[PDB]
Design an enzyme around this catalytic site. Structure first.
Site, short mmCIF file in Angstrom:
data_model
loop_
_atom_site.label_atom_id
_atom_site.label_comp_id
_atom_site.label_asym_id
_atom_site.label_seq_id
_atom_site.Cartn_x
_atom_site.Cartn_y
_atom_site.Cartn_z
N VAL A 146 27.36 50.22 44.93
CA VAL A 146 27.71 49.46 46.06
C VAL A 146 27.85 50.26 47.33
O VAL A 146 27.85 51.53 47.34
CB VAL A 146 29.56 49.45 45.82
CG1 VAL A 146 30.41 48.98 46.92
CG2 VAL A 146 29.63 48.57 44.60
N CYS A 147 27.56 49.68 48.49
CA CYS A 147 27.03 50.11 49.73
C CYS A 147 28.66 49.87 50.63
O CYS A 147 28.83 48.51 50.77
CB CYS A 147 26.32 49.49 50.45
SG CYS A 147 25.76 50.40 51.95
N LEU A 148 29.37 50.99 50.88
CA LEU A 148 30.71 50.86 51.40
C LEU A 148 30.77 51.97 51.95
O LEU A 148 30.75 53.08 51.41
CB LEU A 148 31.76 50.38 50.35
CG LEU A 148 32.97 50.08 51.07
CD1 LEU A 148 33.08 49.08 51.84
CD2 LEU A 148 34.01 49.70 49.77
#
Length: 156
Positions: free
Chosen positions: A91-93
């Site tokens: 996940v890119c966050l």
């Protein structure tokens, strides 16, 4: 790491006492059967009334020895169609990067709710995979069709 393990025990106690309905977050086990607080198997339910509804999306949360200085790595298993989920499942966050918006006080609950929020509202500035980003930009109707199919595929 005593520091990481103490915090992770705190997180586990808090989670078990009070957590959002339909979510799962459980530590795994070592080869000898003992609890491994550094690697958790989690699940995020799709939000009702959205294209994600009915799906249950499994993800692993991996903590480094310097947690909570560092955020956990959060990785969907299997990988998901979403503009901000890398092909690996990661996940890119921004709250999940030490040099961006991670703060040590952020809880596992806050992470999982933040990822659930991300699912229904992609961040188009920083795409992590080409396909879902491209479809999201070019045809939102098709994008949602794909999301609904994925939610059905991952119905519990």
């Amino acid at each position: 790491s005593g520091i990481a393990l103490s915090r992770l025990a705190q997180e586990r106690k808090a989670w078990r006492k009070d957590h959002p309905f339909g979510f799962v977050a459980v530590p795994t086990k070592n080869p000898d059967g003992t609890m491994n607080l550094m690697n958790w198997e989690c699940a995020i339910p799709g939000a009702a009334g959205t294209p994600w509804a009915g799906g249950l999306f499994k993800l692993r949360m991996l903590f480094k020895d310097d947690y909570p200085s560092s955020p956990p790595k959060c990785k969907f298993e299997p990988p998901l169609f979403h503009p901000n989920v890398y092909p690996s499942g990661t996940v890119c966050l921004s709250i999940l990067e030490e040099d961006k918006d991670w703060r040590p006080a952020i809880t596992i609950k806050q992470i999982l709710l933040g990822i659930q929020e991300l699912l229904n509202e992609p961040n188009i500035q920083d795409p992590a995979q080409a396909e879902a980003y491209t479809i999201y930009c070019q045809n939102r109707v098709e994008y949602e069709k794909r999301v609904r199919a994925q939610a059905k595929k991952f119905a519990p």
